[PDB]
């Protein structure tokens, strides 16, 4: 149907948005620490810890299977790289801190793609 091609043109506008987004909150972690998965390797224990592993490889992934619906999903994972963060790491590391900057130097991205999502609906 025509009502489902416009829907699908939609979600994929949305993606292209996203990954501007996504791109825009990486450049936050230029040390790369939420580039890529915690290594079960290399943290054998982390699933005792953190339920919901998140991180922006993981993310993108997603995003290019066209796999977030809407930004308060996207918003969901992004929220999980930092939480995750600052349950497992201690205040005094370097983990902890590029996490809190992520946090606060994305929430302003964060806070006009609302603007742009609502806005191009």
Request: some cysteine.
């Amino acid at each position: 149907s025509m009502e489902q091609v416009a829907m699908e043109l939609r979600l994929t506008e949305l993606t292209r948005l996203l990954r501007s987004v996504l791109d825009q909150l990486q450049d936050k972690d230029p040390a790369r620490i939420f580039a890529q998965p915690v290594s079960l390797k290399e943290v054998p224990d982390y699933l005792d810890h953190i339920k919901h592993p998140m991180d922006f490889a993981t993310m993108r992934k997603r995003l290019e299977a066209q796999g977030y619906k809407n930004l308060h999903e996207f918003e969901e994972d992004f929220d999980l790289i930092i939480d995750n963060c600052m349950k497992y790491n201690a205040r005094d590391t370097v983990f902890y801190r590029a996490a809190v900057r992520l946090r606060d130097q994305g929430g302003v991205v964060l806070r006009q793609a609302r603007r742009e999502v609502d806005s191009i609906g």
